[PDB]
Amino acid sequence: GNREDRKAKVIEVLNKARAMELHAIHQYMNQHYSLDDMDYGELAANMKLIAIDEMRHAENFAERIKELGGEPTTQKEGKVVTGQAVPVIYESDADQEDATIEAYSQFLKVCKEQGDIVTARLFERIIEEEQAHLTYYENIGSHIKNLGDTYLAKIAGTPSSTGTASKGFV
Amino acid sequence: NREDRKAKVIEVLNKARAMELHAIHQYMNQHYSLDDMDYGELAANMKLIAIDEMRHAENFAERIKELGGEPTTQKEGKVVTGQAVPVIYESDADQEDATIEAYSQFLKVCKEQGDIVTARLFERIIEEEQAHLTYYENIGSHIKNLGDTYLAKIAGTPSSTGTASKGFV
Amino acid sequence: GNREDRKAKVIEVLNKARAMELHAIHQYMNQHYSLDDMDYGELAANMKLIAIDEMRHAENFAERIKELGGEPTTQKEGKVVTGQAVPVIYESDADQEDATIEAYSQFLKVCKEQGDIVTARLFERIIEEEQAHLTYYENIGSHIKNLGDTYLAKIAGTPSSTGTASKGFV
Amino acid sequence: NREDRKAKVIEVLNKARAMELHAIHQYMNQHYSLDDMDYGELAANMKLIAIDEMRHAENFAERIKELGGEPTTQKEGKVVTGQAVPVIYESDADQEDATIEAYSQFLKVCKEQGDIVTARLFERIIEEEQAHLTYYENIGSHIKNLGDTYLAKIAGTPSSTGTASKGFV
Amino acid sequence: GNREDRKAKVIEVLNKARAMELHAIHQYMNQHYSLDDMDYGELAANMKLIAIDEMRHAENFAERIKELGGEPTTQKEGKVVTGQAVPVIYESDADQEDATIEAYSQFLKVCKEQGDIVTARLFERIIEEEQAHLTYYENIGSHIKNLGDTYLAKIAGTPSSTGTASKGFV
Amino acid sequence: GNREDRKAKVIEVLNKARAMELHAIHQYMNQHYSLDDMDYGELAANMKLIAIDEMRHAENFAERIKELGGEPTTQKEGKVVTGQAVPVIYESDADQEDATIEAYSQFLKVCKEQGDIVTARLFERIIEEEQAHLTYYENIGSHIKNLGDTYLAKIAGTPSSTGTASKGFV
Amino acid sequence: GNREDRKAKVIEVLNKARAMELHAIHQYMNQHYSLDDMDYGELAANMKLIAIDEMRHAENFAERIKELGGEPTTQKEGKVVTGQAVPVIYESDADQEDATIEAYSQFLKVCKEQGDIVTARLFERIIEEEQAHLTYYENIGSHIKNLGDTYLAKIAGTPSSTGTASKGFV
C-alpha cells in the first residue's frame, strides 16, 4: 500500500487496542473498589497497580496514534461488568487478559504487514506485560478456587497502599 | 428514611463521578494534542490536571462504596476532539466553572440529606476545581494577550510529569 | 590393593554418587517448576535451593574424580518422575534422601577400606547435608498430611525468589 | 486455532530445552578438564557459560509450564568427554552455531503460531548464544595461533566464578 | 540459500545501511557547523548529539558485518548538501530520517528472510532510534514554520555544549 | 458427457466422500477410546454416536456407488491422529467437519453438473448432518475453553452408554 | 518379564488382533454391498450382522489396549479384496475365519505366558464368536457349491433389514 494507507490501517488496530485498554482500566478499577470495600487490601492494591499499567498502555497507544497522524479514541470496547464476587473477578480478568494477548498478536501481525516496525515493537512490549497480568490473575483465581477461606483470611485487613499519592496539579 | 437519604447522595456522587470520567478523557485528549504540537509545559500540566481528576473519580467511587452503592463507569457527555490551542483553554475554563456550579448544587443535596462526610468531600474537591479553573483562565489570558510570543516560549519545553507512575509490572 | 586399584574403586563409588546427584537435580527442578506453576513460592524456592545443593555435590564429586585421575560421569541414575502432586513430591523426596544417605554411607565405607581419607571426608560432609534435606522434606510432608490445605493456603502467593540472578557469562 | 498452535510451540520449547540440558553437561564436563589442567580463566568462563545454559533451560521450562506442557528431563545428544583444549573450543563454537541455527527456526515456528511471548524468549536467548559463540571462536583462535605464551598467561590464574551460590544448607 | 549466501545477502544490506549512516554523520555535522556558526546553541548541540547516534549506528553495523565475515564499507551513500538554510535543514533531515526508517524496514525483512535473527534485532533497535530523530526534526521544523524568528530568538545565544569533551587518546 | 462418463464422474466424488467418512470413523472412534479411558462418559458416548453417523454415511455412499455400478472404496483419506488431548480433540473435529461440508458442497456441484439429482440429494441430506456435528464440536470446544475444569468435573464419571448393545450375528 | 514388559507384549498381540478385525469389517461390508446390490437380502443382512460383530470385537480389543496403557491401532491388517463373486465370498470368509481362530489361539497363548488372565478370557470369548462365524460361512458356501441357483432362488428378493436403524447422534 501507499504511505497514508499503511498508517490508516495501523492507526485502526491501535485504536482498537486503545479501546480495549480503556475498558480494562474501568473494569479493573471497578473491581478494585469492591476489593477495597471488602477489606482485601493486597488484592485491591495489586488490582489498582494493574489498572495503572493499562492506563500506561492506553497512553502509549495514543502517543503512537498521534505520531502517525490519527485521533486517539475515547470510547471503551465493550461493557464493564459490575458487582462481581471475588472468585468471578479473577476468573473474568484472566479470560480478559488471555483475549487481549490473542487480539494484540493479531494487531502485531497487521503492523508487520503494513511495514510498521516501531508500532509492532510497541505491541510486543505491551503483550509481555499482558502476560504478567494474566499469570497474576490465573494464580489468584487458583488459590481462591482451591484454598477458600484460609487464603482470604490471610488477605483480610492487609495494607492496600499502592505507594505515595500520584503526582497531580494541585 | 435512611435508605432514601443514601440513594439521593449516591446519585449526585455518581453524577459527579461521571463528570470526572469525562474530564479525564477530555483533558488527556488535549494532552495528546499539546504533546504532539510539542508544547511540553502545556502538555505536562494538562496531564497533571487529568490525574487530579482521576483522584476525584476514585474518591467519589470510594464514598459511593461506603454508602453501599455502585460507582458508575460511564462518563457524562462527549469528548470534543481536534480543538485549537485557544479553544482548549477557553472550553476547559468553561467546563471547570460548570463543574464547580454543579458540585455546589450536589453539596447542598448532601447537606439536605444530612450527609456531612459526603458534603466535606465535595467541599475539598470544589477547592481543587477552583485551582484548575484559575490555571485555565491564566493560560487562556496569556494566549489571548501574547499570542505566538507565548507559544514561542512553550515550544520545545520539557513535557515530563515526573517519574513514571507506580504500575504492576 | 595397589595404588591404581584403590583409586579405581573410589572413582567408581564417586561416579555412582555423582549419577545420583544428577538425577536429584533433574527431579527436584522438575518439582520446582510444578510448585512454581502452582504459585507456592516458599515451597518452590526451597526446592530450587536444595537442587542447587545437589549441583554443588555433583561438582564436588566430579572434582574429586578428576583429582583421582578419573572421568566424571554425565549420566543420571534412574528415571525422573513427572506430574507428581504436592503430597507425593514430599513423600517421594524424603524416601530418596533417606536412600541417598544409606547409599553414601556404604560408599563412605568403601573409601575407608581403600585408605582414601580425603574422599571419605567429602562423603561425610555431604551426608550431613543430605540429612538437612531429609529433615526438611519430612517436615513439609508431615504438615501437608496433618493439616492439608489449611497449611498450603498459607504458602500460596508467597515470594519464590531464591536471591540474586545467577552469576553467568553474559 | 489456539490448541494446535500451543502444541506446536511446546514442542519446539522442549526441543530447545533438551539442547540446553546437553550444553550444561557438555560444558561442565570441559570445565572439569580445564580446572584439572589449572587454566583458571578458561575454567571459570566455561562454568559461567554453563550457568547461562542452566538459566536458559529454566526459562524454557517456565514458559512450557505457562503453556500447560511438561518440561523435558532428557538431554539431546551425547556428551563428549576427554576433549583436548583445541577440540574443546572448536567443538563448542560449532555447537553454539548450530544452536543459533536451530533456535532461529524454532523462533520462526513461534511467529507462525502467533506466540509473541515465546518468540521474544527465543530472541533474547539467541543473542546470548551469539555471545557464547564469539567467546569460543576467539579462544579457539588464540589457542591455534598464539601458542605457549598464550597458555602460560592463563596458567595458574584464578578459577573462581564468585561466591558459592545460594543453596539450602 | 546456503550459509555463505545467507551471510553475503545480510552483509550487503548491512553495508548499504552503514553507507547511509556515514552520509548522515557528514550531513548532520555539516549542519551542526552552520547552526553553531549562527550561534543557535541548543539546535547546534542536539544536531551533533544526533550525529553521534549515527556514529554509533555505523559502528554497530560494522561490528556485525565483521561478525559475519564481511568488510565494513568506508563510502557514504549519496552527496552531502551544504549551505542549507535553517528551514531546509529541518525539512530535509525529517525527510531523510523517514527514508531511512523505510529503507531499514526493508533491510530488516531481508534479515528475517535470511534467517538472521541477531541482525534483525540490530535493525529493530536502530529503527526505534531513527524514529526519535524523525520526531525531533519534525518538531523543530514545525516550530520554525509556525513561529519563525520568534522561536529562533529564543535559541539565539543558548549554550551549545554537548557535555564533557569526548574520550580520546591524548 | 455420455451416460457412463456422467456415472464415472459421480462415482469418483462419491468414493472421495466415502474415503472421508472412513477416516472420520477411525478418527472419532480413536478419540472415543481416549474419552472413555478418561472416564468422561457423556463426551465418550456422543463421540461414538457421531462416529456411528459417519458409518451410516459411509454405507449410504457405498449403496449409491453400487446403484451407479461402481465399486465402493475401502481406504480412508488421510491419516488418523492419535494421542490427542481433549481441547485438541474438539478443535480438530470442528475443523474437520467444516472441511467436510466444504468438500461435500463441491461434490454436490459435480453431481448437479453431471445431471445426477439422486446423488445431489444424498449429499444435501448428509451435509445437513455434518452441520449438526460441526455445531456440536464447536459447542464442546467453547465449554472447555470458557469453563475449563468446572465443565469437565460435571462430565467426570457420567454414563458412557450409547444404548442397547448393537444387533450382531451371534 | 517385568510389569511393563508383560503389558507391552499383550498390547502387541491385541493390536494385531484389532488390525485383523478392522480388515474383517471392511472386507465383509464390501461383500454386503455386493450381496445387497444383487438383491440377496438374507445373505446381505447376515453379512452385515457379522461385520457388526467384528466392529464390537475391534472395540473390545481397543478398550483392553487402553486398560493396559497402550494405543489402539487404526490400521487394518491385509488387503481387502473387492468385486468378489458369490461362490468366492463364502469360500474366502470361511478361510479367513479359520485363520483368525488359529491366530487368536496363538495370541491367547501369549496372554497366558504374560500372566494376563483378563486378556486371555477376552480372546477366549471372541474365538467362540469367530467359530459361529466360521460355521455360518461354511454352511452357505456348501449350499452355493452343491445347490447353486436353486438355493439362491430362495434368497432372491428376501428382506435385507438387520432391524432398526442403529442409534446415532443426529
Ligand code: FEC
Ligand atoms: C482512579 C483512576 C482512574 C479512574 C477509573 C475509574 O473507573 O474510576 C483513572 C483513569 C484513567 C483513564 C481512563 C486513563 C486513560 C486516558 C486516555 O488515554 O484517554 C488514565 C490514564 C493515566 N492514568 Fe489514571 N487514567 N491514574 C491513576 C488513577 C486513576 N486513573 C493513578 C493513581 C495514577 C498514578 C500513576 C503514577 O503515579 O505513576 C494514574 C496515572 C495515569 C497516567 C500516568 C502515566 C505515567 O506517567 O506513567 C495515565 C496516562
Ligand code: FEC
Ligand atoms: C555443578 C553444576 C551442575 C552439574 C552439571 C554436570 O553435568 O556436572 C549443574 C547442573 C544443572 C542442571 C542440569 C540444571 C537444569 C535444571 C532443569 O532445568 O531441570 C541446572 C539448573 C540451574 N543451575 Fe546448575 N543446573 N548451578 C550451578 C552448578 C551446577 N549446575 C551453580 C554453581 C549455580 C549458581 C547459582 C546462582 O548463582 O544462581 C547454578 C545455578 C542453576 C540455576 C539457577 C539460575 C538462576 O537462578 O539465575 C538453575 C535453574
Ligand code: FEC
Ligand atoms: C466399534 C466400531 C467400529 C471400529 C472403529 C475403530 O476404529 O475402532 C466400527 C467400524 C465401522 C466401519 C469402519 C464401518 C464402514 C464399513 C464400510 O462401509 O465398509 C462401519 C459401518 C457400520 N457400522 Fe460400525 N462400522 N458400528 C458400531 C461399532 C463400530 N463400527 C456399532 C456399535 C454400531 C451400532 C448400530 C446401530 O445401532 O446403529 C455400528 C453400526 C454400523 C453400521 C450400521 C448402520 C445402520 O444400519 O443404521 C454400519 C454401516
Ligand SMILES: [Fe+3]
Ligand atoms: Fe493493557
Ligand SMILES: [Fe+3]
Ligand atoms: Fe492487561
Ligand SMILES: [Fe+3]
Ligand atoms: Fe475533578
Ligand SMILES: [Fe+3]
Ligand atoms: Fe477539574
Ligand SMILES: [Fe+3]
Ligand atoms: Fe546430594
Ligand SMILES: [Fe+3]
Ligand atoms: Fe539431597
Ligand SMILES: [Fe+3]
Ligand atoms: Fe543456551
Ligand SMILES: [Fe+3]
Ligand atoms: Fe550457548
Ligand SMILES: [Fe+3]
Ligand atoms: Fe542512524
Ligand SMILES: [Fe+3]
Ligand atoms: Fe537517524
Ligand SMILES: [Fe+3]
Ligand atoms: Fe459424515
Ligand SMILES: [Fe+3]
Ligand atoms: Fe461428520
Ligand SMILES: [Fe+3]
Ligand atoms: Fe472378530
